[model samples]
Target: RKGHFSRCPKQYKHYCIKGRCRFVVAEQTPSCVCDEGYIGARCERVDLFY
Candidate 1:
């Protein structure tokens, strides 16, 4: 009973917020790899700066 993670889709068809996903056996599922300007599990945040 220690699973609060969202189940991944395909293309992981279900991508992240301004990010992408790839199935990683290491995590036993797909994960989000945010863009350069953004970084977060769901890419919900940004790396705001000049």
Candidate 2:
């Protein structure tokens, strides 16, 4: 199983239309998580007015 310890994409680039990290999880790449205050398949800000 793979392990992810940090936020993917590091920062939201212009190409990041949703301004989030598109991550996936599985047995080989089992580690999947979001930063504090963020959630969803693609980590997004929930407190922002978008």
Candidate 3:
């Protein structure tokens, strides 16, 4: 099966990161800044653990 890629939460909440389907910004480099409810470089950090 194909994979599913979700938009970066930071793009919605912070408008800092790009929200492209491929997760690539045009001019800016890739960063790990996650959303408010998430953390870590990959945004895999959930809030329930903390």
Candidate 4:
């Protein structure tokens, strides 16, 4: 489980701590794919509700 966040940045502590990002593994690579309301390689961007 800890390996899932190995590539994520320190700033991601906010979202990851809040359980907003979804962890996934593909082709032996780990990633934090954001929900519909968020975007970014690290899921650091939030989408507008409008």
Best by TM-score: 1
* Tens-digit lDDT string for candidate 3 (3-47): 344445634534343222334465444433445665555454556
- Provide the overall lDDT of each model, using Cα atoms, as 2-decimal numbers: 0.63, 0.44, 0.44, 0.51
Position 50, candidate 4: lDDT = 75
Q: Model 2 segments beyond 4 Å from truth?
A: 1-29, 48-50
Residue-by-residue lDDT tens digits, candidate 4, 1-50 = 45443355547656453224333445455444456676565566667667
RMSD of each candidate relative to the true structure: 8.3, 7.0, 9.9, 7.2
Residue 6 of model 1 has an lDDT of 62
Q: List the residue pairs that clash in candidate 2.
A: none
Best by lDDT: 1
Off by over 4 Å in 3: 1-33, 48-50
Candidates by TM-score, descending order: 1, 4, 3, 2
| Residue lDDT tens for model 2, 1-50 | 46353344646443333443444443233233444555444554454555
Collision pairs in model 3: none
